[PDB]
Symmetry: C2
Subunit: 125 residues, 2 copies
């Protein structure tokens, strides 16, 4: 169960960070990509944080524990931003383009894309 202002800061940072990378990769790989192909690669960012939240959570915690002081939302932004910067997604984007298995844009991918990133639903462990 986790406190909203922490959870949200984690989110806003991580997916924003995954999207800068896609914005950098697309400047040079996107010449041939339809809009719904470019928007399928933004869904992949959002879903990536979903399938990896619990793994990121063990690491957030042991660090938040290591602060000695109470956590303020400020250090949830910093850890969140440090995952956004530290993950290699172009690898993923390359395998999907290279095997032309960039997913087919289904209605529910746009359900996840129309949402404001602080709201993308995750689960736990």
């Amino acid at each position: 169960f986790l406190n909203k202002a922490f959870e949200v800061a984690l989110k806003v940072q991580i997916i924003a960070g995954f999207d800068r990378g896609l914005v950098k990769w697309l400047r040079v790989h996107g010449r041939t990509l339809s809009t719904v192909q470019k928007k399928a690669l933004y869904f992949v960012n959002r879903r990536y944080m979903q399938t990896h939240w619990a793994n990121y959570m063990l690491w957030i915690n042991k660090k938040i524990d290591a602060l000695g002081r109470t956590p303020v939302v400020g250090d949830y932004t910093r850890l969140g931003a440090e995952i956004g910067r530290r993950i290699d997604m172009a690898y993923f984007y390359d395998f999907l383009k290279d095997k032309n298995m960039i997913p087919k844009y289904l209605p529910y991918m746009e359900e996840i894309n129309r949402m404001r990133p602080a709201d993308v639903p995750v689960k736990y462990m």
Copy 2:
């Protein structure tokens, strides 16, 4: 644009071969996976063929011409069988498995999974 007699024979064989690679992958990467994941993955087989069918069409227009005579459907069944074995989907299944990006099971995907092989929609180019 290909008499459906032949196109049906390529599909049944392509997808069949792709599935014998997946049941044999599942036979060592299973208990660990929910049912919907084993079925997102069957969609991946179908979809891969819909997204690489132009590359099958170039290779089959070529080795059909080389026949020296009119094809009948059995020439199809053999080249469809073949396109179905000289792939190793295992690496594709494993990057979705390690990078925990097996696709989320969505509506459209079980409509394609419901369809007899012989009817999986491929558009001609």
